[PDB]
Amino acid sequence: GEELIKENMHMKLYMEGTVNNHHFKCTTEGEGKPYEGTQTQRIKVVEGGPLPFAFDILATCFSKTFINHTQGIPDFFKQSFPEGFTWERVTTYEDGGVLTVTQDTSLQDGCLIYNVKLRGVNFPSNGPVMQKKTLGWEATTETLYPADGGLEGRCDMALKLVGGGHLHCNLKTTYRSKKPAKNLKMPGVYFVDRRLERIKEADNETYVEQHEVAVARYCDLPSKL
Known part of the structure; x- marks a missing residue:
């Protein structure tokens, strides 16, 4: 299963969505090193462009297979192939x-x-999202917990704003393997440091280039229990 994910792996994404009643579609091509945690994606807004909202809010929709793992943490996403996985x-x-x-x-x-x-939905019209006043995401640290036969993740993020300051959000995600649980080694609780970065953009954010590096690990602190 994990042998299917090679040192180099390409990817393609199809995205259809709506934000405050604006319908759009996107497509991407990219590649990366699944085991180094690095990757690149080149996104095209193919319909509904230009978006009347900050592209930043779509950033985190464009790759759980590309993460470096340390200290022997099992790879829930790489183990799941060829069947694959979903997240919500x-x-x-x-x-x-x-x-x-x-x-x-x-x-x-x-x-x-x-x-x-x-x-x-419910994005304020004079907020930085709809006003396009965002300058990207800060680096992050998420926590993943065993839940049933899959993973749940939690992550506070911070959207940098033109003029200074941040607009914060909380991410709640459920990752679900399409592989029998009898064939997966469920990890324990752990953490993933991430840094998503906008490398390029063109044509009023209807073409975008993003990079992301990500490493999984434990707390690496002593414990008296």
């Missing part, structure tokens, strides 16, 4: 914005195929 996410922003996502990850002809359906 709700992102709540502190000024009232709510985004919900459902994602499917398959492996076909040695290519990772992503299918994303999302829905943003």
